[PDB]
Amino acid sequence: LYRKYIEYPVLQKILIGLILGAIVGLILGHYGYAHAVHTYVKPFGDLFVRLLKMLVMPIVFASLVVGAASISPARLGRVGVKIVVYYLLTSAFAVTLGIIMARLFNPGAGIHLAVGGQQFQPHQAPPLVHILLDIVPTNPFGALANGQVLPTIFFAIILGIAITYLMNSENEKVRKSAETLLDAINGLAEAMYKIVNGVMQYAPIGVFALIAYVMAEQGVHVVGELAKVTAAVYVGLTLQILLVYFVLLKIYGIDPISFIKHAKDAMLTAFVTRSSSGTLPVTMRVAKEMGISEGIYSFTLPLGATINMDGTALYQGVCTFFIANALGSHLTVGQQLTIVLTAVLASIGTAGVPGAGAIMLAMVLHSVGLPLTDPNVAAAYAMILGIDAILDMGRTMVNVTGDLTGTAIVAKTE
Incomplete structure (x- = not known):
């Protein structure tokens, strides 16, 4: 009955769906029915993911405009600098x-691994100059039209600042228009x-399908070195x-265990969706219910979803370590690790x-000098691809958790 549900x-509902989907996907993958899962159960999960993507751009744009208009530029710049510092600190801890x-x-x-089999088109990290320039869109409507949260x-931000400047003007009509x-x-x-x-009320079905498909596809591959x-x-x-x-x-006075009871929705949605940007509407919703101001979270969370290096730090370190040993x-001589980290930070372009998960790893390996055309690198990269989604699940979970933590810290500070 709909009302009871x-x-x-x-x-x-979310926890029950997640656990049941994990169990069912594991069983079906073990028994070899992964294709049936990917055919019939997988689509339901993509529907939830697609709904979240649909909400990503409008909610981010509108909420950020409103928050920027609500708070002065001086506060916004301070918040941006503070959250950048927080992300740098957490990235150092994460690496x-x-x-x-x-x-x-x-x-x-x-x-040892067998050379041959699946071979991939190498990937290269986008140049730093291009990535910085892309922050300014040549067409704001086009940026809204096709993704590009940054x-x-x-x-x-600029539209909100312009709006708040207009509202302080002296022409009555201009104030009315703004x-x-x-x-x-x-x-x-x-x-x-x-x-x-x-969409969150719908999520229990979506989370179940997502985790079931991920498990059936890859959890069977989580064996041995993987x-x-x-x-x-x-x-x-963890x-x-x-x-x-x-x-x-705790150091900033925010109780973590109480903060978990708020971030649960964001954490699990990020987990299943495997995309921090995709799960942004839930994360921003969580920040709103946390009582955090519009001008702060509306800026930090969308920003963090693209520059939060916490998840990619752990993923890249562990995987690149696996590739080397494989x-x-x-x-991995000294400063080569720093090269890896720098290329990782430039991987916000993806x-x-x-x-x-895989694309960033490909770019990092290419930057190191281990292009995927190398047959030996190909086998290890394929191995990692065998569990990419499972790793990306937790990567997104930690990324969104860190975004919420930084947003809460900055909100408490301000």
């Missing part, structure tokens, strides 16, 4: 943890939040959330692409 708490856990688990140590963020535009945008944002509530890689990555995410995020929340070259 809706009346049942969403959090309980430390990634190195530590990769060394602890020693994945792919001396396990230039949308810039246009939203107020009407801001009210229309605010109405759009609130409508997006209501649609987020509806199992070590997955364990290292997930232990890294240590991040427990040492960096929780300690930061090739047999235990040595934000929102479905293959976030």
Whole structure:
């Protein structure tokens, strides 16, 4: 009965769906019915993911415009600098943890692989100059038309600042025009939040299908060295959330366990969707219910979804460690690690692409000098691809958790 289903708490529904989907997907993958899953159960998950993508651009644009108009530029710049510093600190912690856990688990140590089979088109990290320029869109409508949250963020910020400057003008009609535009945008944002509530009510079905498909496809592949890689990555995410995020929340006076009861929706939606940008409407909704101001979270969360290096730090460290050992070259000489990190940071250019995990890894390996055309690199990269989605699940989870933690910290500071 529909009324009973809706009346049942969403959090309980989400957990039940996630667990049941995990179990069913694992069973079907073990018994070899993965194709049946990918054919009949997978589409339901994509519907939820597609709904979240649909809400991504409108909600981000409207909420950021409203928040920028609501707060002065001086506060917005301070918030941006603070959240950038927070992301740098958390990224340092995340790379430390990634190195530590990769060394602890020693994945792919001396396990030879067969050359041949699947071979991939190499990938190269976008040039830094191009990425910086793309922050300014040549066409704001085009940026809204096709993804590109980052230039949308810039246009939203400048439009909000212009609107708030206009509202302080001396021409009555100009004030009326600015107020009407801001009210229309605010109405759009609130409508997006209501649609987020509806999509969240639908989510239990979507989360179930997503996790079921992911499990059936790849959880059977989590065995041997790959199992070590997955364990290292997930232990890294847990240590991040427990040492960096929780300690930061406590040091800034935000209770973590109470913060989890709020971030649960964002964390699990990020987990299943495997895309921080895609799950943004839920994360922004969570920040709103947290009481965080519009001008702060509406800027930090969309920004973090593209520059949060916490998840990609652990993923890249652990995987690149696995690739090295798999090739047999235990040595990744010194500054080559710094090259990896710098190329990773430039990998924000692939934000929102479905293959976030593998693509970034391909770019990082190419930057190191291990292009995927190398047959030995091809086998290890294919191995990682065998569990890409499972790793990306947790990567997105930690990324969104860190985005919410930084947003909460900045909101408390301001």
